[PDB]
């Protein structure tokens, strides 16, 4: 679990989206496995605009932060779940390091803000949902 509080929005995994960010949709992604919704309080987070590719991020599976050197976002193969059908997942970074399904949502950070959040894995890999392009997050 997970999610990035921006100004009024609210980042999470769109498979971890609860009835109240559905019932508060600004916008929603199958394909980046992403959703964002309003909120009335000021969030706490600072988004990244670079092209980093070092970071380091929060494993809840080994209550840790962990550096990794991450791929730039791209279209990768993503195996079926419980969530979504076998498809390619967009704007998608892969990084060595430890995660386990419940890690979903923690914080990928650089010196610059935040760059995304966790979205997938397996097998010594993590993958990451980037939200830099997403220019509107700050008006
Ligand atoms: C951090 O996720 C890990 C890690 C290790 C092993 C397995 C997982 C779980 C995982 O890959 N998914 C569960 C939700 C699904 C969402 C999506 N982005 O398509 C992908
Ligand atoms: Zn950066």
């Not at 964002?36 to 988004?47: F, M, N, R």
Request: with cysteine.
């Amino acid at each position: 679990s997970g999610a990035i509080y921006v100004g009024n929005y609210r980042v999470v995994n769109r498979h971890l989206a609860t009835h109240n960010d559905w019932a508060n949709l600004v916008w929603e992604d199958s394909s980046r496995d992403l959703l964002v919704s309003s909120t009335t309080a000021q969030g706490c987070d600072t988004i990244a605009r670079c092209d980093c590719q070092t970071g380091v991020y929060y494993c809840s599976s080994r209550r840790k932060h962990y550096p990794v050197s991450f791929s730039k976002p791209s279209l990768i193969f993503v195996e079926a779940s419980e969530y979504y059908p076998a498809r390619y997942q967009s704007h998608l970074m892969l990084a060595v390091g430890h995660s386990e399904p419940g890690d979903c949502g923690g914080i990928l950070r650089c010196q610059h803000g935040v760059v995304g959040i966790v979205s997938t894995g397996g097998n010594g890999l993590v993958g990451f949902a980037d939200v830099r392009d997403l220019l509107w997050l700050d008006e």
